[PDB]
Amino acid sequence: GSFVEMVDNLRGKSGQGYYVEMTVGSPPQTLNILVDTGSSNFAVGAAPHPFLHRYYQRQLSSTYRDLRKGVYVPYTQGKWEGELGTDLVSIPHGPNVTVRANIAAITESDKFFINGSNWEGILGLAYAEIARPDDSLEPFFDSLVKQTHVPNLFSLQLCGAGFPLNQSEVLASVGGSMIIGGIDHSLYTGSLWYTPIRREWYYEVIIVRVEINGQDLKMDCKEYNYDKSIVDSGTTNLRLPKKVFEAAVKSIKAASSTEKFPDGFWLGEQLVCWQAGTTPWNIFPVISLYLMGEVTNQSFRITILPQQYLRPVEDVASQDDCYKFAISQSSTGTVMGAVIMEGFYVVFDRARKRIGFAVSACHVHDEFRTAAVEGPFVTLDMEDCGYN
Numbered sequence: 001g002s003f004v005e006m007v008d009n010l011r012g013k014s015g016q017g018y019y020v021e022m023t024v025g026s027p028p029q030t031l032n033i034l035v036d037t038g039s040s041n042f043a044v045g046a047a048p049h050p051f052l053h054r055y056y057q058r059q060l061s062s063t064y065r066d067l068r069k070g071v072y073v074p075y076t077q078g079k080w081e082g083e084l085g086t087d088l089v090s091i092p093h094g095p096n097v098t099v100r101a102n103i104a105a106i107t108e109s110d111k112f113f114i115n116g117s118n119w120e121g122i123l124g125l126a127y128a129e130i131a132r133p134d135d136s137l138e139p140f141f142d143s144l145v146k147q148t149h150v151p152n153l154f155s156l157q158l159c160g161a162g163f164p165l166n167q168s169e170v171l172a173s174v175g176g177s178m179i180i181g182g183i184d185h186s187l188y189t190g191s192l193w194y195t196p197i198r199r200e201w202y203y204e205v206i207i208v209r210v211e212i213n214g215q216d217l218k219m220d221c222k223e224y225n226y227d228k229s230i231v232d233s234g235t236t237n238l239r240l241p242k243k244v245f246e247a248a249v250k251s252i253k254a255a256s257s258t259e260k261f262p263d264g265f266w267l268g269e270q271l272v273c274w275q276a277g278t279t280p281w282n283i284f285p286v287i288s289l290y291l292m293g294e295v296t297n298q299s300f301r302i303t304i305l306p307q308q309y310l311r312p313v314e315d316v317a318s319q320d321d322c323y324k325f326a327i328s329q330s331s332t333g334t335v336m337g338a339v340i341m342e343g344f345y346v347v348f349d350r351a352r353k354r355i356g357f358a359v360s361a362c363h364v365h366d367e368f369r370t371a372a373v374e375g376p377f378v379t380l381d382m383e384d385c386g387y388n
């Protein structure tokens with residue numbers, strides 16, 4: 001019901017990530033750690049870097065254990081290399097428990113750390129199947145549940161400000177909540193609707209229908225989940241498979257056609273700006289994603305506003321309100337990233353192999369429209385939407 005100790009324990013923003021304070025080692029070393037449901041390694045800066053103000057010093061921890069094994073983790077953009085070990089870990093604004101967890105001590109990296117993000121490591125909250133070097137490296141959350149009485153569930157409320165924050169404002173500001181071991185009813189309005197976790201590797205789900213202002217995108221539903229659809233707090237954008245991206249953008253352009261925007265805007269590259277307070281939210285469509293429900297032949301929908309998919313950014317000069325388009329293409333399936341998660345309180349119910357969605361008590365909206373979670377809808381042949 002109520003988890004006051006964990007409410008408001010996140011800071012950050014969609015563009016650079018949301019992070020939680022953790023301590024590692026004995027005596028405790030404090031570090032800020034990116035909350036990432038799209039990966040499964042707990043990995044921390046452990047050597048000086050131009051963008052790190054502090055790092056894990058294994059030689060100062062009496063409880064550090066060396067696993068004598070290296071790990072190399074390349075991504076499409078960026079990479080890091082490190083040394084595997086274990087140590088005692090706590091989350092100060094979390095459950096009052098201390099656990100021994102695997103930690104990859106990052107000793108070298110390229111384009112991984114972000115200048116001014118304020119985080120020094122990543123907490124991969126997904127499953128062992130996608131851990132590096134292999135699935136025998138138990139992820140943090142699995143350790144936490146095995147070693148303590150914490151229920152096998154966590155929930156995330158990511159709070160977008162609706163306007164830009166500089167590095168000073170992000171430091172002073174509450175970015176949201178990670179509730180470990182429960183669901184806090186103050187963080188949402190309306191009902192929670194649950195979709196099954198298709199397979200425990202990423203948090204994989206199945207999308208069964210997409211609408212732009214109520215108009216069906218009318219693609220074969222397999223296209224929406226090609227080659228998977230995941231919920232990922234460590235990706236900024238809503239990312240869509242190439243063909244779905246092309247269809248969706250064509251439809252969003254048609255809905256907003258009273259104003260013409262440059263190709264670079266739709267490509268996610270360039271900002272657009274309006275005079276202060278005059279952003280024409282009403283010309284942009286709402287986007288609905290229908291998700292497989294828990295009951296046979298039942299779906300539900302989550303609906304976001306342009307206040308979610310237009311990401312506020314600071315002007316290159318002004319008092320203008322400026323934004324980038326935060327929907328982009330993917331060659332690795334749909335990614336429901338931070339700009340989608342900012343609409344919703346998201347419950348990662350690992351114990352019951354399901355993900356819940358409710359309207360966020362902190363989502364950005366206007367006097368005419370709000371984000372929504374609605375159901376049920378009768379939907380047939382939903383398993384056929386999943387890609388094999």
Ligand SMILES: C[C@@]1(c2cc(-c3cncnc3)c(F)cc2F)CCSC(N)=N1
Nearest residue numbers: 015016017036038039075112234235236
């Ligand atoms: C681990 C990874 C990831 C995320 C962010 C990151 C997080 N939030 C915002 N911007 C960047 C980052 F800065 C570095 C990363 F390696 C791989 C790319 S996708 C993902 N889910 N996690």
